[PDB]
Amino acid sequence: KRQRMVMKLESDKTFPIMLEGKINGYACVVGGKLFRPMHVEGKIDNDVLAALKTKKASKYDLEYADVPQNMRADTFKYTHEKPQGYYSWHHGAVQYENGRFTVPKGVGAKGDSGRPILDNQGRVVAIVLGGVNEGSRTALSVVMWNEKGVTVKYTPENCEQW
Amino acid sequence: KRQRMVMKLESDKTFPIMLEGKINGYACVVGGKLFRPMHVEGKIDNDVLAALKTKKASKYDLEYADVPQNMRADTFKYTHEKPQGYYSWHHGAVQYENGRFTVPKGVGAKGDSGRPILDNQGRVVAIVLGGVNEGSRTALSVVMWNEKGVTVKYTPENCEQW
Amino acid sequence: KRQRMVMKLESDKTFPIMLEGKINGYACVVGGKLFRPMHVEGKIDNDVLAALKTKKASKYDLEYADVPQNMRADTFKYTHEKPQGYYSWHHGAVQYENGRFTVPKGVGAKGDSGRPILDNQGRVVAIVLGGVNEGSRTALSVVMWNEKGVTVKYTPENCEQW
Amino acid sequence: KRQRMVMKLESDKTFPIMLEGKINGYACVVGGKLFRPMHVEGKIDNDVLAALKTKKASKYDLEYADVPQNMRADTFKYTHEKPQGYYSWHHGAVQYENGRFTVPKGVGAKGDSGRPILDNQGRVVAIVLGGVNEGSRTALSVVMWNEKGVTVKYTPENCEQW
Amino acid sequence: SICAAIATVSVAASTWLFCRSRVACLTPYRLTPNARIPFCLAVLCCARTARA
Numbered sequence: 035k036r037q038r039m040v041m042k043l044e045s046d047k048t049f050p051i052m053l054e055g056k057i058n059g060y061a062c063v064v065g066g067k068l069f070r071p072m073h074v075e076g077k078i079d080n081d082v083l084a085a086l087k088t089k090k091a092s093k094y095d096l097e098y099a100d101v102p103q104n105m106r107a108d109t110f111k112y113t114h115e116k117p118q119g120y121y122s123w124h125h126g127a128v129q130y131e132n133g134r135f136t137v138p139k140g141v142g143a144k145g146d147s148g149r150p151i152l153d154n155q156g157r158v159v160a161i162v163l164g165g166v167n168e169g170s171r172t173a174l175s176v177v178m179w180n181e182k183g184v185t186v187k188y189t190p191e192n193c194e195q196w
Numbered sequence: 197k198r199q200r201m202v203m204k205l206e207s208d209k210t211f212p213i214m215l216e217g218k219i220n221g222y223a224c225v226v227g228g229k230l231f232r233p234m235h236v237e238g239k240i241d242n243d244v245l246a247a248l249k250t251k252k253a254s255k256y257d258l259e260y261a262d263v264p265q266n267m268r269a270d271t272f273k274y275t276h277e278k279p280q281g282y283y284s285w286h287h288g289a290v291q292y293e294n295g296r297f298t299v300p301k302g303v304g305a306k307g308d309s310g311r312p313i314l315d316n317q318g319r320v321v322a323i324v325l326g327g328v329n330e331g332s333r334t335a336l337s338v339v340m341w342n343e344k345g346v347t348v349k350y351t352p353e354n355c356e357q358w
Numbered sequence: 359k360r361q362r363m364v365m366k367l368e369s370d371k372t373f374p375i376m377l378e379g380k381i382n383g384y385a386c387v388v389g390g391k392l393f394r395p396m397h398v399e400g401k402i403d404n405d406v407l408a409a410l411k412t413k414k415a416s417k418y419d420l421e422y423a424d425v426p427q428n429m430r431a432d433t434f435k436y437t438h439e440k441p442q443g444y445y446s447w448h449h450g451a452v453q454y455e456n457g458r459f460t461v462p463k464g465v466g467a468k469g470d471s472g473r474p475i476l477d478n479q480g481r482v483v484a485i486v487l488g489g490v491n492e493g494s495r496t497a498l499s500v501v502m503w504n505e506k507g508v509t510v511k512y513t514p515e516n517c518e519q520w
Numbered sequence: 521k522r523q524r525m526v527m528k529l530e531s532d533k534t535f536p537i538m539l540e541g542k543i544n545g546y547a548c549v550v551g552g553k554l555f556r557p558m559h560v561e562g563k564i565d566n567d568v569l570a571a572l573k574t575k576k577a578s579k580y581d582l583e584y585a586d587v588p589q590n591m592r593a594d595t596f597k598y599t600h601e602k603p604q605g606y607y608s609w610h611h612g613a614v615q616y617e618n619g620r621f622t623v624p625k626g627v628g629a630k631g632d633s634g635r636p637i638l639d640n641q642g643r644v645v646a647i648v649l650g651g652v653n654e655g656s657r658t659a660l661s662v663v664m665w666n667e668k669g670v671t672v673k674y675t676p677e678n679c680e681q682w
Numbered sequence: 683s684i685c686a687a688i689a690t691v692s693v694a695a696s697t698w699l700f701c702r703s704r705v706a707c708l709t710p711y712r713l714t715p716n717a718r719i720p721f722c723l724a725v726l727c728c729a730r731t732a733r734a
Contacts (some may be wrong), residue, residue, distance in 0.1 A: 055217040056377065081306070217379060243380075389715035415712040416705070422713035427677065431655020436715045482715065507721055509714045 039122045042156050046110060049079035051148070058099070060148035064158050066106030070097040071147045071163055072087050094177060094187050104175060113157040114181040121159060124149045128174070134188055135160060136173045144196050151176065164189075165196040201284045204318050208267030208272060208278050211241035213310070222310035232259040233309045235357050251263055256339060256349050257325070272312060275319040276343040283321060286311045290336070296350055297322060298335045306358050313338065326351075327358040362404035363446045366480050370434060375472070384472035388482050390430030394421040395471045395487055397519050418501060418511050419487070434474060437481040438505040445483060448473045452498070458512055459484060460497045468520050475500065488513075489520040525608045528642050532596060535565035537634070546634035550644050552592030556583040557633045557649055559681050580663060580673050581649070596636060600667040601641040607645060610635045614660070620674055621646060622659045630682050637662065650675075651682040704728060 043062075051059040053076030061070040061078050068083060072095040077084050082105070088097040101109070121128045121135075128151055129136045135151065142165050151160040162175040168190075175193045178186055199216040205224075215238030223232040223240050230245060234257040239246050244267070250259040263271070283290045283297075290313055291298045297313065304327050313322040322338040330352075337355045340348055367386075375383040377400030385394040385402050392407060396419040401408050406429070412421040425433070445452045445459075453460045453473055459475065466489050475484040484500040492514075499517045502510055529548075537545040539562030541551045547556040547564050553560070563570050568591070571576060574583040606645040607614045607621075614637055615622045621637065628651050637646040646662040652678075664672055707728035711719055724732035 052217075214378065389716070389717040390693070391713055391717050393713045393715070415709060417709040418712060420712060428655055429652055430717075431657060434715070503714055503716075506713060507710075507716065507719060509710050509712060 035122055036126060039152055039156075040124065042152070043124060043150075045136050046108060047080070047083075047105075049083065049094065051076040052079050054076070054184050058145055062110060062148060062150055063105075064110035065112055066103070066109045067101050069148075070098045070099075071095060074147055092186070096177070101147070110158045111153070111156070113153065113155070113159060114179065115153075116159050116178060119152070120122075121151050121153055123151045123162065134173060134190075135162075135176050136168065136171050137165075138171050139167070139169065140172075142172060142174065142196055145196055163187075163195075164173055166190045166193040198282055198288060200246075201314055201318075202286065204314070205286060205312075208270060209242070209245075209267075211245065213238040215239070220307055222308070223261055224272060224310060224312055226272035226312065227274055228265070228271045229263050230261045231310075231323070232261075233257060234259050236309055237349065256328050256347065272320045273318070274341070274348070275317070275321060276341065278321050278340060283313050283315055285313045285324065291333075296335060296352075297324075297338050298330065298333050299327075300333050301329070301331065302332060303333075304336065304358055308358055325349075325357075326355050328352045328355040341346075359446055360450060363480075364448065366476070367448060367474075371404070371407075371429075371431060373407065375400040376403050377401070383468055384470070386434060386472060386474055387425055388434035388474065389436055390427070390433045391425050392423045393472075393485070394423075395419060396421050397475055398471055415501070418509070434482045435480070436503070437479070437483060438476065438503065439477075440483050440502060445475050445477055445488065447475045452478060453495075455519075458497060458514075459486075459487055459500050460492065460495050461489075462495050463491070463493065464496075466498065466520055487511075487519075488517050490514045490517040521608055522612060525638055525642075526610065528638070529610060529636075532594060533566070533569075533591075535569065537562040538565050539563070543633055546632070548596060548634060548636055549587055549591075550596035550636065551598055552589070552595045553587050554585045555634075555647070556585075557581060558583050558609075559634055580671070582663070596644045597642070598665070599641070599645060600641065600665065602645050602664060607637050607639055609648065610636045615657075620659060620676075621648075621662050622654065622657050623651075624657050625653070625655065625657075628658060628660065628682055632682055649673075649681075650679050650681040652676045 048060065050064045051061055051070070051074050052056045058076050059071055059074030061068060061182070068086060070078070070088060072090060072092070086099040086101065088099040090097055116130065118130055121130060125141045126137070136140065142162070147163050149162045150158045153159050160178045162174050162176055165172050166176040173190050175189045178188070180186065208226045210222065212219045213232070213236050217351055221233055221236030223230060230248060232240070232250060234252060234254070237250050248261040248263065250261040252259055278292065280292055283292060287303045287308070288299070304324070309325050311324045312320045313324065315321050322340045324336050324338055327334050327336040335352050337351045340350070342348065372384065372386045374381045375385055375394070375398050378436045382400050383395055383398030385392060392410060393413060394402070396414060396416070410423040410425065412423040414421055440454065442454055445454060449465045449470070450461070466486070471487050474482045475486065477483050484502045486498050486500055488499040489496050497514050499513045502512070504510065534546065534548045536543045537547055537556070538562050544562050545557055545560030546647045547554060549571060554572060556564070558576060558578070572585040572587065574585040576583055588635050604616055607616060611627045611632070612623070628648070633649050635648045637648065637668065639645050646664045648660050648662055650661040651658050661675045664674070666672065707726055710722050720732055
């Protein structure tokens with residue numbers, strides 16, 4: 035499964051945020067428009083996408099920009115059906131329970147911001163922005179969207195920017 | 197042939213123009229003095245060569261500088277004999293016809309400025325500065341020099357800086 | 359022997375001084391505090407060590423900084439017993455005679471500043487800062503410390519910063 | 521060796537400091553008089569020895585008391601010959617270098633205060649009072665006595681009471 | 683004013699000499715790998731030197 039998830043993430047145009055040769059984060063295109071975590075500095079690893087001017091949203095520490103329709107051709111597919119269970123992402127599985135996403139300890143660190151969370155159908159359900167040490171596991175700070183289109187950010191108390 | 201061309205380009209001191217870890221172009225030494233495309237920003241990948249002060253030539257968007265004789269020891273050999281036919285360069289072959297250089301489509305892009313064009317004897321006949329989409333092929337904007345020493349720049353209408 | 363010397367230098371935390379992707383020198387931690395040649399520009403290849411503020415010493419063209427005790431755990435071991443004979447360093451052996459260190463010609467060049475000199479027990483006896491062409495050999499400009507704690511810099515006449 | 525060291529420590533009258541059923545430290549008799557770390561609270565695991573009134577020494581955080589001659593019959597043997605090398609104690613070996621005792625990381629913790637350091641002849645050379653994290657090893661804060669009878673306490677900066 | 687200017691120049695020269703002496707003293711007070719230099723401060727006593 036993880037192999038297929040990585041293949042889908044690579045085939046879909048996704049590009050890390052390069053600064054001085056160091057990967058400081060990741061950015062992706064979902065729903066035909068680029069998003070980028072504001073706290074991560076640097077430029078997307080795509081000259082064509084870098085040409086797009088972004089807008090800031092301090093409340094969520096996220097940026098967004100318009101993507102040309104021809105490049106909107108193949109982007110992430112979002113869904114609002116988020117039942118309890120387990121999902122898949124770049125560094126393995128993620129447990130969804132009580133409305134929160136959690137992964138085993140040692141998974142995720144500074145520089146992983148921007149990795150989406152995929153369902154069994156390969157549809158995006160959340161975007162990972164950070165996390166906090168949770169003993170045997172760690173809880174990720176993510177943003178998810180309901181069927182009504184409301185942006186909800188779940189942030190654990192004293193969450194670290196990962 | 198392309199293998200030998202790459203070997204000759206590497207053995208001869210040639211250095212890309214590095215800026216923030218990104219290759220934005222190339223520069224070479226021909227006739228014992230360094231040349232650099234003015235539109236490309238950054239510094240040559242050679243501290244000793246970077247110490248040389250360049251002079252600007254807006255008309256051709258090119259720069260030049262004096263190279264020490266000891267470093268003039270091994271530079272590109274230029275020739276004025278430019279008959280019609282095919283030549284070789286870093287990304288393969290180039291067709292010369294009607295006084296213009298053309299290569300198949302998909303060959304050459306932003307960041308290739310500075311790559312010279314070599315003959316069967318390994319002598320430089322032109323310097324590639326840009327290009328423009330030409331359907332099944334693309335036409336490169338190049339500068340060539342006649343036996344009388346006249347600098348002539350061939351620029352297709354609405355040519356893009358490649 | 360050289361294999362063991364390289365293994366000891368690598369296992370002990372040593373980091374080259376990176377500038378624009380180029381190795382311009384080396385820096386190491388001896389006696390639990392970092393030292394860096396002042397003439398070499400750039401930052402240590404360690405974010406944690408780069409956080410340490412250095413102090414300048416123009417007289418010897420060297421810098422120093424305090425290292426956290428937890429990182430002082432494993433540093434170079436210095437000794438004052440410097441008898442005549444041969445020692446080992448990164449680029450092979452070094453001859454010590456008349457109070458001066460000399461190595462065969464062709465060993466050492468610009469960018470090697472900071473390489474320590476080790477004895478048979480793996481203890482540091484000197485730090486290489488430069489050198490000068492000495493015919494069949496070359497003499498390195500080094501700093502060594504006596505049992506009384508006196509810093510002595512041996513600099514050949516017209517020595518070049520290597 | 522460690523087996524013999526433990527056998528010698530057990531045969532010689534040594535008793536942990538019990539408080540509410542918890543071992544909070546250790547105390548021993550050397551040179552015919554009992555010593556106890558002042559920071560450790562509780563009573564010696566010996567009713568006869570507990571009957572002895574102790575005197576305080578704030579400077580070293582240590583206590584001492586007179587032991588009856590009949591019980592002075594068999595106590596620790598102290599020596600002033602402390603050459604560099606390795607010694608043995610309850611939790612294994614200890615490295616002595618530069619006048620300081622160091623042991624590998626993970627050896628020693630809160631409650632080990634009072635464990636003496638023995639030489640190859642089973643003679644006491646130092647008493648362990650605390651320690652501090654030193655990366656791959658840890659440095660113990662100990663007290664040692666020279667042939668002139670001077671009490672010297674070596675305490676690393678920001679040493680923790682172990 | 684002439685006397686004041688001369689005194690100011692003298693003070694500046696003394697300060698410069700003190701700074702150069704401090705630099706010269708700090709020259710052996712560099713890393714000198716031991717992370718411990720009590721004895722140079724105890725001998726030279728240039729300024730802010732050995733507590734004992």
